[PDB]
Amino acid sequence: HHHHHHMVHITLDRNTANSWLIISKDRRQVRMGDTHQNVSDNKERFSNYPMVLGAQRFSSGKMYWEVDVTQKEAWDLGVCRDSVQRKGQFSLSPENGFWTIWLWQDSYEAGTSPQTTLHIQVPPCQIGIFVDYEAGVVSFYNITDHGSLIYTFSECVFAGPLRPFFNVGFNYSGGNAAPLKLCPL
Ligand SMILES: Cc1cc(C(=O)Nc2cnn(C)c2)no1
């Protein structure tokens, strides 16, 4: 792909984070803590899952960023509406305001309803995410495999401002403690 020149500098929004997440000083890395991180509750925090939003809001244009997923067993990545539900149980779908892919139990899937199997020969260590607001497109790229396409959501109905979306996943196994990292431009 040739989307690199739309690179944006994403930072994580502490106020949206699940209360168990640990965000680095530079707001560029996040991992699951082994306990509650001693923050007050608020209506923005994702309560049920280890999720956090980017601080940036996008309502036009073309945007690109990259995330490091090295050694993780489980994670979700993409974008979502600013007004997605924060509390209780929900599925990641475009109907609920999410355009995402994930790793779970050694398979990669796109967050359609129902979910779509992805075909990845080279397990990615870094994922590129491209959003074209006007075109209604969200695309995912395998940076480890020379930028090869993973998945394109087209005919997207954003219906609001978009925010970068992250889920570091649970760590029931003891094998999923590694962070998500926003990679430098
Ligand atoms: C302060 C403050 C308020 C809340 C709050 O309302 N949380 C909530 C709402 N619905 N559910 C299921 C949880 N959390 O912190």
UniProtKB/Swiss-Prot annotation:
One of its GO terms (biological process) is negative regulation of protein deubiquitination. Signal peptide: none annotated. One of its GO terms (cellular component) is autophagosome. It is found in: Cytoplasm; Cytoplasmic vesicle, Autophagosome; Nucleus; Cytoplasm, P-body. GO terms for molecular function: DNA binding; RNA binding; ubiquitin protein ligase activity; ubiquitin-protein transferase activity; zinc ion binding. Autoubiquitinated; does not lead to its proteasomal degradation. Deubiquitinated by USP4; leading to its stabilization. Autoubiquitinated. Residues 8-185 form the B30.2/SPRY domain. Induction: Up-regulated by IFN. Its main location: cytoplasm. Keywords: Cell cycle, Coiled coil, Cytoplasm, Cytoplasmic vesicle, DNA-binding, Metal-binding, Nucleus, Ribonucleoprotein, RNA-binding, Transferase, Ubl conjugation, Ubl conjugation pathway, Zinc, Zinc-finger. It comes from the Eukaryota. Homotrimer. Component of a SCF(SKP2)-like complex containing CUL1, SKP1, TRIM21 and SKP2. Interacts with CALR, CUL1, FBXW11, HSPA5, IKBKB, IRF3, SKP1 and VCP. Interacts with SKP2; the interaction with SKP2 does not depend on an intact F-box domain. Interacts (via N-terminus and C-terminus) with DCP2 (via N-terminus and C-terminus). Interacts (via C-terminus) with IRF8 (via C-terminus). Interacts with ULK1, BECN1 and with ATG8 family members, including GABARAP, GABARAPL1, GABARAPL2 and MAP1LC3C/LC3C. Interacts with TRIM21 and SQSTM1/sequestosome 1. Interacts with IRF3. E3 ubiquitin-protein ligase whose activity is dependent on E2 enzymes, UBE2D1, UBE2D2, UBE2E1 and UBE2E2. Forms a ubiquitin ligase complex in cooperation with the E2 UBE2D2 that is used not only for the ubiquitination of USP4 and IKBKB but also for its self-ubiquitination. Component of cullin-RING-based SCF (SKP1-CUL1-F-box protein) E3 ubiquitin-protein ligase complexes such as SCF(SKP2)-like complexes. A TRIM21-containing SCF(SKP2)-like complex is shown to mediate ubiquitination of CDKN1B ('Thr-187' phosphorylated-form), thereby promoting its degradation by the proteasome. The coiled-coil is necessary for the cytoplasmic localization. The RING-type zinc finger is necessary for ubiquitination and for the IRF3-driven interferon beta promoter activity. Interacts with SKP2 and CUL1 in a RING finger-independent manner. The RING-type zinc finger is necessary for ubiquitination of NMI. Belongs to the TRIM/RBCC family. This is E3 ubiquitin-protein ligase TRIM21. The chain holds residues 291 to 468 of 470 of the full protein.
